[PDB]
Amino acid sequence: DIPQPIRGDKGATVKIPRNIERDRQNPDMLVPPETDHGTVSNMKFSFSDTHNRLEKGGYAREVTVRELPISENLASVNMRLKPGAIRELHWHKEAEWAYMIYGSARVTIVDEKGRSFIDDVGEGDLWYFPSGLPHSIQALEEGAEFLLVFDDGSFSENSTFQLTDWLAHTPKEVIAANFGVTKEEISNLPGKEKYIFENQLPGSLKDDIVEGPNGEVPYPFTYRLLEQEPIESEGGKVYIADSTNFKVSKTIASALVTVEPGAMRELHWHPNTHEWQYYISGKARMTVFASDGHARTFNYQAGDVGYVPFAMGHYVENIGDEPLVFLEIFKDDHYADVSLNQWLAMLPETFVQAHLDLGKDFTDVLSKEKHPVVKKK
Amino acid sequence: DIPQPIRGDKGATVKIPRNIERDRQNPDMLVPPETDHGTVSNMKFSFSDTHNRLEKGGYAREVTVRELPISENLASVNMRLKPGAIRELHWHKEAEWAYMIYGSARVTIVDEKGRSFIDDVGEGDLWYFPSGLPHSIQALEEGAEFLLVFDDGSFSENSTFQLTDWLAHTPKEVIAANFGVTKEEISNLPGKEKYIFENQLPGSLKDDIVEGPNGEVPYPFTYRLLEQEPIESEGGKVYIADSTNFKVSKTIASALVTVEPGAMRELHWHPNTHEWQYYISGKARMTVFASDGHARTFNYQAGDVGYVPFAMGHYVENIGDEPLVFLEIFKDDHYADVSLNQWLAMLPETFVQAHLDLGKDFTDVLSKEKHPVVKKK
Amino acid sequence: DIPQPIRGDKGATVKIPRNIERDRQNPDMLVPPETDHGTVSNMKFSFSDTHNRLEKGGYAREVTVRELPISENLASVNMRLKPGAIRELHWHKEAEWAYMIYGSARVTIVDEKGRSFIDDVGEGDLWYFPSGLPHSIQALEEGAEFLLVFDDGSFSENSTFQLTDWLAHTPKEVIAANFGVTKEEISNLPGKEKYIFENQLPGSLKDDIVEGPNGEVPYPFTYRLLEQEPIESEGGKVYIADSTNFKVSKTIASALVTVEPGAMRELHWHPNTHEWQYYISGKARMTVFASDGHARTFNYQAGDVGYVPFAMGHYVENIGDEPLVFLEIFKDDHYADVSLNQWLAMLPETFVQAHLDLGKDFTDVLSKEKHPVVKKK
Amino acid sequence: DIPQPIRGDKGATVKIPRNIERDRQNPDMLVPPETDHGTVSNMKFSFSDTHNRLEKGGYAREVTVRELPISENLASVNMRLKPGAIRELHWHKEAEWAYMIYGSARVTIVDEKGRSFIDDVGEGDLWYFPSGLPHSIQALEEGAEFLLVFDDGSFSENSTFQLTDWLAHTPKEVIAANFGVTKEEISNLPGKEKYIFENQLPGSLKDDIVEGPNGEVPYPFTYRLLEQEPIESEGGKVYIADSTNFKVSKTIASALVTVEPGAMRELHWHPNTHEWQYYISGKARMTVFASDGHARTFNYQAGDVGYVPFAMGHYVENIGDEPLVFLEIFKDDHYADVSLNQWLAMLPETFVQAHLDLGKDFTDVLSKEKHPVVKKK
Amino acid sequence: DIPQPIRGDKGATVKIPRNIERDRQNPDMLVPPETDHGTVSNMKFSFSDTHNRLEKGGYAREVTVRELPISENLASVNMRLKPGAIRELHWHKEAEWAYMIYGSARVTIVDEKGRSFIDDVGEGDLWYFPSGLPHSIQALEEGAEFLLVFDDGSFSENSTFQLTDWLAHTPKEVIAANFGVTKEEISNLPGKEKYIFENQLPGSLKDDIVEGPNGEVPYPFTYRLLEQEPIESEGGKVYIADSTNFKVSKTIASALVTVEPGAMRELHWHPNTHEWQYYISGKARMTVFASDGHARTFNYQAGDVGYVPFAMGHYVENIGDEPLVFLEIFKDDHYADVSLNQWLAMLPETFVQAHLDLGKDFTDVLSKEKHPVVKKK
Ligand SMILES: [Mn+2]
Ligand SMILES: [Mn+2]
Ligand SMILES: [Mn+2]
Ligand SMILES: [Mn+2]
Ligand SMILES: [Mn+2]
Ligand SMILES: [Mn+2]
Ligand SMILES: [Mn+2]
Ligand SMILES: [Mn+2]
Ligand SMILES: [Mn+2]
Ligand SMILES: [Mn+2]
């Protein structure tokens, strides 16, 4: 049918030409809760509303501060690689965090002591590359599609420092002096970047491992998130990776949240920093409570980026018939949340009652244990 | 069918959960022209991706710098009023420009000399309220739906100065002293804003006209845009209103552009300032050329806001089977464009040939007359 | 007695050490109107809360953006000169406006065509020196005390460009070359600024007038404000000087307002720009209405600076037994106000009634004529 | 008597209407030391010059960057609670530090692991609530009045996140799903914030202590400052609390300083960060030395906020007949000072003599031991 | 001869008046490598292009953000002292790092616990004074000339806080109270700063050492850089001092690099922060690779400051017949580099080959060991 912005005796039919498909995706924006109030920044953007850079070997598209200006500290790229295809050896100022949604890939990184780490990453695995350390990605036989997160909102994937670009803009006589070779021996260097390029599938990981005189890296740059024991609650699961468990991940803390149909990520906030969200699958709504009587509700589905500024109250409700799966990302060395339920459970019952104008029948339901994902009764 | 981000031997299928409806709306973003290059800011946002404020009597939703950060100087509200419903007497810092898409409404404004202007506005008519001058809107028997544009991108419709809000936050003894009445005579003043409220249809315009000792306003605050003679070219029509014809409209210049199926707003730029766009109906693509080899293509349809930063090259192509109708808005005292075709037509033919590596067969087609909208052969 | 922050059943006694004298000056801040709400910037500062620069010949103290940060565009100096004393020949980037509160002074200015203007200024007279044009002040037999206003809030009177300071920091050989004299002939130049210095009373104005080959200045740099016919209303008087009457005063518009005991500057706003206020004498309160249900009330008395950001609603009530006299200053080429009373008087009565939930008994009192200062009945 | 801005042969009488009460409070501003020079930002503001928010149960007023713009990193609230009255359960982005000037109060806080801390705070005690952790205050039988300090100068007490405000702006169906209750069971939730509200006195602290499955908090959130041994010197006492002793107080370091009549906080600076000051009781002057020959003297008394930008030289002299009691606050993990006396005492005597053009009779008085508060002989 | 901006068939002779001496110093700017491209900020400035402050006892000149705006975080002073001359006891907000190029000097510093450190510094030695800690420099019998680096680009040596300046701007009665002396005993204090002043040579270091009750400083404030074992490679030497070895040097990391004729600082970048450079002796060129196909080459010689923004690729080639000696400075707690050669050596050879379109003959030359300075074959 044709939705209309009408809630009881408020609102009216749309009389001008309109985008009905978007309206159907955003039922809680066309018709917000009556409890929403006030001006709140946009907290929602779709990767489908971005330009996709297509190359021989894959694609990349990005949601940055230029698309979602509330997110000044975090930006993201959705990158796809065909089997064997290579994301060119490169580096950047920003630290990089990744979640492998589809397929698998081999990564390399060499640190500032000349120690190398090469590893394969499958579905549900992470990587983290510290700022400035050079790296590569090469998809294996399934190809690969993954979400990258960078710890500056001004990032662009089009502005990384790439190996062949560096060399193409260095005098040939300097390259030749650098390596002790002749100009003639390097005459076939590419004249411009490769960025993403097709290539034959690599061999087994064990045959690629490079030995060196500087030893093994002290901490691995990949993490098997979905192999960890999640926090399990009645309506779903939460898998957390931050610097306390994924040791190298100093500037990005993360959680993968799964919310069953009929369940919700409970009312909570984060006492440390802003939340950046990516919706892997399913359909959600979230109200962001911004203080001073301000609140705004947003809809999300697969391919959407979301955001919750530092300490704002929120929940994430599954509003569809399939599991809702999303990431909570933070530019910090740890994950932290405060649960509304747990907070109140840990206070004297008559003090809570004095605040809420409710009785023992309400305070009796509170739980001293935190259940990040709750199920409707 | 299911579109894929593939262009010849570049790109790949999407392997993760995705937004197919948005992808179908954005064919030139999922699969951009091969001539696009480089990082360009987002220049596209949909009103359907905003929270709609619903009231008894209508609604309002807004696209501001918080949604579309490239647009720092201009923001917009899509407002709807039911028959008789009133947008409360109010004022703001920003100048306001309006286009009546549907229905009709009566406006009031009183200037700083106490001169009043009251008028009815129908489909295709404009208004402009200078900064700080107080005004109202009341829909007539059809209701009304219109686009407002404000000359600061940080504007919000939730932060206007409203008559009843002012009074509700003034001491009653001061209001009483101000008007020479008792506190008891003003005890029924509202305790909070009305903003939008239902009301009986007004009488005929002629019975509302208020006489006063300060004379008539020197210039009218409404303009009948579609009653003017348009610039007519082969593929469509352009109706311009700026301060040279709509005399009061000092900070906003505007054009309504209609592009027939198979036609396009020609390659041009604006030598004065940024363009802000609203797509009333139809489907378009535009490439924005940002210098230094940068260009990015965007798709638009009804309900979308677009933008072209100052002097960037562009065209707007109708990519659908119905007329494409959009507005070009500028924060300036005049409308100006430079046509690529006309520019080259006015130069020596061999000089143009020396630039383009093309011959007389090309320079022979150039036209010294500007045709803002051209039709495909 | 000892005031307490108590309003009915709200508030409590002060239990900590406190400033009772300030509390008595600020009755509407210790106990605000119940109609105040929300966070509003400070709009009030006293010259008595500033450092006074004392010199042989007078003093100067200043209220700038460093004291009152809401006032980014306007700053002010209270300057005093003893009989004959000279404020050293100087210039600055900012335009300067002045009001002579006490005494009289002779000013000089020479423009960029070498035309000079020399004039005496008495109580109630103004001057205005355009940006960058050099000038001096010399008090006559009564001395002089005056208020200066500069059109940048970052100004300091300690950073003007002074004649002797310039010369003290120019090589002597360059000064000598500049004027065609020897170094020995300029050996007695001061080694540092004078700034303010004692001097013998000048002769009659007519004997100082300097003739030159470049003609008379086209417009005078002084204005006799109190010799003009004021707008007279029931509770007081308003004398306006802006660029329409005081022709040179391009960046500062001004009004001197006198409010009798029992009267008030009516409910109004300014549709052009921010108001900066100086309270010459008496005692006032003002509520500033900042939109979105925000309002805050401030107290003022002699020596206080006030402020009203662009378009905010306000009134100024005399709360004492003597006349209240203050200045309204604007960084603009004209003075403009919108009267609440006049605005509503110029609208259809049933439309006003529909907004205010009041009847004909209220709309019957409205006046189509603007009375800037009204008297309580 | 009537003070005048005259120092020897400099300055003059005030000839315009003036604020004599403020002038009497500011003797060193109306008549500064001759050693003051140059433009220095205002470093002084009174809580009496702020709007007091009155509620059933108490009040709150604030000095922020909007009042004192030099203080960009720290803001403060003076809050008062009647017996039993509650400052509503809330949280904010900023860390909060407190000093209990009058009375006593019970605080709660629950951390991000669901561990609760509940404690009573009396006169001279502190609390510190880390950023984002939720908390409450409830005055006991004497009521309470206290100073709060927040580690962002842009803070407002009107913009905290409050429990009932959050719930009033969350859909009822979501609250009901969150807790596993019906909408009918939560129908009596408040429709707006409480902020401060009257309530019956609580029971004994021991009966409120809440046990839980997550253990005790590792570090307490209150500190008994006046129970510590102070640094005692000849003219007074200094009690320091920073993160080395009050372990949780990571972003605020503090000292309570008492200066006897005839004594002074010695010439010193802080090598770490800016000082923010609150004057609890008595009367002071301070000269701030800002380098490059700049210095400005300010007066302070009970209710005043002061400031000393990072590393600027200063002293605080008691200029009254009662003890001077003030706080020195720093946004840092430690308190540090450099004493002028100690610095010079620790250098070779002839090196100091070469700088000061003074002899052994001066360097003989220097002390290698730091005495923060010295007494006049 | 007369160089011309001609490279093969590109460029042309200079036809206007020109600076031939500068052109000869900048051969790679008048005629850049053909591999340079795009707009890059200036990364080069000479101390000879600054005003030199001359005093009795020496001089000082500075390169700050006002000269080299890319360097926002670091500024530098070239200071010279004659034998015995003293840089006056002073402090500042910034941390200070120093390299002694010529001669020797005695430094003092007293920390916030009153512990003093006094030491002599010779050629190739460093000092580091933490933020806010007071210090002095006194040249010994050879005089001294040294480079200072401050960890804010906005620093000026003319704005330090100086002992005598502080006292000259403090009331005499306060100084007298501070020390327990009479005003008469301090009447000979200087009336203004000394800054730099002549003085007799000090005695032996051992006779200056001051004992005190607060113990020895835990870490020394000087470091003998050239007494350390350098990293030695084929074309030169690198001596690194950062917080891991020069323990107090928390905010500045440093390397002294010596590059023999025919050698070069290899292709590398820094993964941590920006590089600031000072060229002690010799002649260099460097290409800075700025990503996105941007690169610009600069020339440097003795007296020049250089810069490399965070993570940009670069090399430093000796282009003269004498050793090239320069400093690499970083605002960080450690030095880190990534070598292009080592990076590629630590990857699988066929992966490198796939990137570079080169064969085993190239990957066979790569070295797993980092050689910061390489020599041409
Ligand atoms: Mn990367
Ligand atoms: Mn969350
Ligand atoms: Mn409006
Ligand atoms: Mn256009
Ligand atoms: Mn002046
Ligand atoms: Mn006004
Ligand atoms: Mn709090
Ligand atoms: Mn201090
Ligand atoms: Mn120094
Ligand atoms: Mn380097």
UniProtKB/Swiss-Prot annotation, chains A, B, C, D, E:
Enzyme class: lyase
Its EC number(s): 4.1.1.2
Listed InterPro entries: Bicupin_oxalate_deCO2ase/Oxase, Cupin_1, GPI/OXD, RmlC-like_jellyroll, RmlC_Cupin_sf
Active site residues of this protein: 328
Cofactor binding annotation: Binds 2 manganese ions per subunit.
A GO CC term assigned to this protein in UniProt: cytoplasm
pH dependence: Optimum pH is 5.0.
Effect on the protein of changing residue 335 to F: Leads to a 13-fold reduction of CO(2) production
Entry keyword Cell inner membrane: no
Domain of life: Bacteria
Annotated Gene3D superfamilies: Jelly Rolls
GO molecular function per UniProt: metal ion binding; oxalate decarboxylase activity
Annotated residues for binding of Mn(2+) 2: 268, 270, 275, 314
Compartment list: Cytoplasm
Occurrences of domain Cupin type-1 (ranges): 45-187, 223-364
Keyword Mitochondrion (UniProt): no
One family name in Pfam for this protein: Cupin_1
Cofactor(s) the record lists: Mn(2+)
Binding site for Mn(2+) 1: 90, 92, 96, 135
Biological process according to GO: oxalate metabolic process
Family of the protein in this entry: To B.subtilis OxdD.
Subunit (UniProt): Homohexamer.
Protein name, per record: Oxalate decarboxylase OxdC
Natural source organism: Bacillus subtilis (strain 168)
Lineage: Bacteria, Bacillati, Bacillota, Bacilli, Bacillales
